[PDB]
Structure prediction request, 449 residues.
Amino acid sequence: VLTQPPSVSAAPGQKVTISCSGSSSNIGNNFVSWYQQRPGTAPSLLIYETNKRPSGIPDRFSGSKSATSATLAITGLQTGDEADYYCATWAASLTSARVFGTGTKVIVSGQPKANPTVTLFPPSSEELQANKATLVCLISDFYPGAVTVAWKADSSPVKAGVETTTPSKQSNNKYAASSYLSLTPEQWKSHRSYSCQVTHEGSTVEKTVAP
Amino acid sequence: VQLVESGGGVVQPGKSLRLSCAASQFSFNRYGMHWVRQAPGKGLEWVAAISYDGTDKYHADKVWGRFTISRDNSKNTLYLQMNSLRAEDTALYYCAKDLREDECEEWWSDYYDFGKQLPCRKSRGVAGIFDKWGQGTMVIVSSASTKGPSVFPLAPSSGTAALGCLVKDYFPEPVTVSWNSGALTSGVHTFPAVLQSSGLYSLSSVVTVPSSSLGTQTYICNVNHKPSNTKVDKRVEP
Prediction:
């Protein structure tokens, strides 16, 4: 299970760093492939065999590798570099392990950031009697539009029941997204509180509700 | 190099479907081939792989015994038999090509005798590098059809304050929402709907109004789902 940073961002010019990670079984013994995927278009090979770059790819895109990690790097950023960046490994030959990384969205924007205004709502009395539960965390007015919602119940994190929409531009050129934590009434009455952690540009904002 | 996928569409969970990938502009019989799906909008996931001769077959555990990759070098076509589908299999499937030109080194010299032919002992094998991609073909597996939205109230939180109403479990789009019979367009924010694991849609529309007018002014969420001919006027209370 190779994991990568959810989001990355930088103004045009400065250098960027993206890193994979995992056991030596799927890192050390093997090589590292990198792939770029611009929005609304198919992926493309950026780097294979850890370092070597195919033709058409500038010398800016430098690869790397270590004991239990592997780092991609982009020196001078253009508006075009703005894309999704996945890493991959294939050997030896394989196990029940994964194949591609979780992803890493690179946003190229020198424009000033705008923190998200998180709004959390608890389920309705009407809904609980309909034998269901739903927590609605609404995220609005943010930029460069890179979020990563995370739900928690009494400190402990939650995994199942989450559905998070993709960011979307508003009228004011700022982004907005919504995340729902669908639940059962029995789960909802089991914990003291439920939290909604929105991770945007490092800084995290946590709202919380209770019955 | 040019790859073109086809065969995708909308099929209920359980029923089958077959995806084809028409290879062109390269020596098909030499390179390995892969299938890579991508749920919108989430990460990539390799499905299955196959070598030049078809002797090697690879699959992900989540598709262990419900998907089988195969090829026809005579027609330069790559085939993926998708039967016993799940909703989680819903994704855009990319046809990928392996970078390493495969070649055989050791032959058995035991059987048959042409008798075509002799398989390879130590071929170069797939490298796992997806150099050339297609635009992909979409596969939609959903146990859903036309259904009306279950509207529910929302709380008063503090813009100062912020009210709304939840549009739950409906299909298909569009669903329009207004407030107080279109009298109140203002401090309104209608978020985008969702794509549930069960393939049903659900949106939310928050509204930020004077906290002083709450006890006095009453706000009524007007929902509308024309496909199901359903209209709803939900009155939101603190």
Q: What stands out?
A: The longest helix of chain A spans residues 125-129. The CA atoms of residues 14 and 76 of chain A lie 6 Å apart. The longest strand of chain A covers residues 133-142.
